[PDB]
Specification:
This protein is an all-alpha fold. 77% of the residues lie in helices and 0% in strands. The chain is elongated, with a radius of gyration of 14 Å. The two termini are 18 Å apart. The protein binds heme C. The site of heme C has 20 residues, from α1, α3 and α4. The PDB classes it as electron transport. The entry lists the keywords Four-Helix Bundle, K59W, R98C and Y101C mutations. The assembly is monomeric.
């Protein structure tokens, strides 16, 4: 799907994690964020449409997602350890990554 769709998926699932009823719901949401994040990483955002694929900007753009996926995976580990609250806390920390990217490229 396109960048926008992927972003909506991330935002939607993040709020799901915050509402987190059970471990299952947090894991499902995190898993969907993982896929959406990796999918988004392959797109070319509007602000960089005129830039080369190998440009420093694009690599920086792609880097933002490497960080997000790492954080998501770490939250996944916590969730699969049965530590649901810590995993939700970790999901909250993710926001810093979202905001950083939006500042430069949104
Ligand atoms: C860069 C590496 C990004 C990371 C990490 C995240 N987002 Fe993002 N987001 C990015 C761009 C360039 C844009 C503009 C997309 C466009 O062309 O319209 C966005 C936009 C959003 C939006 C609003 C627009 C929409 O999705 O329709 C939301 C709701 C959004 N992003 C949420 C979001 C969340 C929750 C993230 C972290 C968990 C996140 N984004 C990361 C680039 C990047």
């Amino acid at each position: 799907a396109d960048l926008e769709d992927n972003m909506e998926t991330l935002n939607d699932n993040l709020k799901v994690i915050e509402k987190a009823d059970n471990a299952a719901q947090v894991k499902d949401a995190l898993t969907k964020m993982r896929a959406a994040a990796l999918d988004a990483q392959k797109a070319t955002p509007p602000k960089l449409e005129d830039k080369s694929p190998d440009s420093p900007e694009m690599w920086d753009f792609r880097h933002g997602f490497d960080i997000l996926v790492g954080q998501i995976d770490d939250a996944l580990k916590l969730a699969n350890e049965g530590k649901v609250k810590e995993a939700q806390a970790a999901a909250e920390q993710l926001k810093t990554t979202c905001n950083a990217c939006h500042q430069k490229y949104r």
